[PDB]
Amino acid sequence: GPLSMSCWLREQTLLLAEDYISFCSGIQQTPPSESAEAMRYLAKEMEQQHRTKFRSLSQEFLDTCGADPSKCLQSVMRELVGDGKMNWGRVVSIFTFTGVLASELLSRGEEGSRRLAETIADYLGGEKQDWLVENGGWEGFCRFFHNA
């Protein structure tokens, strides 16, 4: 139905990804939601824990997949998740990577964000719909943050 569960999750994911991309692209606003406060903290924390690997994958991605960043990104996301139990940590890694892309892009030029956020929303809100719901939605992410 209109604004079903999948729709609400997709929209929420989309705007969370638009926030983090903005956050990494030199924009400074208070977090628009609790989930955004959580992601900004956890995604940047994960970046510092692996800065060279994310920066290296990001540069390679930009230098290889300029033709269509979206379809490469879909593959990257699948490989970030891998074959094991999915978890909020894996989800965070998706945001981290895309935020590093966004910042490296701005150091070089400028706006693929619109493309990137939708691609994230389609993958998590669409493909991984079942895991997201099973794990409480973005509310469950906020709980994961308030105990991490």
Residue numbers in the entry: 1 to 110, 113 to 150
What did the paper state?
To determine the structural basis of NRZ interaction with BH3 motifs of pro-apoptotic Bcl-2 proteins, we determined the crystal structures of apo-NRZ and its complexed holo form bound to the BH3-motif of zBad. Helices α2-5 form the canonical hydrophobic ligand binding groove observed in other Bcl-2 family proteins that is utilized to accommodate the zBad BH3 peptide. Surprisingly, our structural search and comparison using DALI48 revealed that the closest structural homolog of NRZ is in fact Mcl-155 with an R.M.S.D value of 1.7 Å over 136 Cα atoms, and a sequence identity of 15%. In summary, like other pro-survival Bcl-2 protein structures solved to-date, NRZ adopts a Bcl-2 like fold and its most closely related structural homologs are the cellular apoptosis inhibitor Mcl-1 and the canarypox viral Bcl-2 protein CNP058. Comparison of the backbone structures of NRZ and NRZ: zBad BH3 complex. a Cartoon representation of apo NRZ (light blue) superimposed onto NRZ: zBad BH3 complex (green). Here we examined the structure and interactions of NRZ by determining the structures of apo-NRZ and its complex with zBad BH3, the orthologue of mammalian Bad and measuring the binding affinities for BH3-motifs. The structures revealed the conformational changes in NRZ after binding of BH3 motif ligand and provide a structural basis for NRZ mediated apoptosis inhibition.
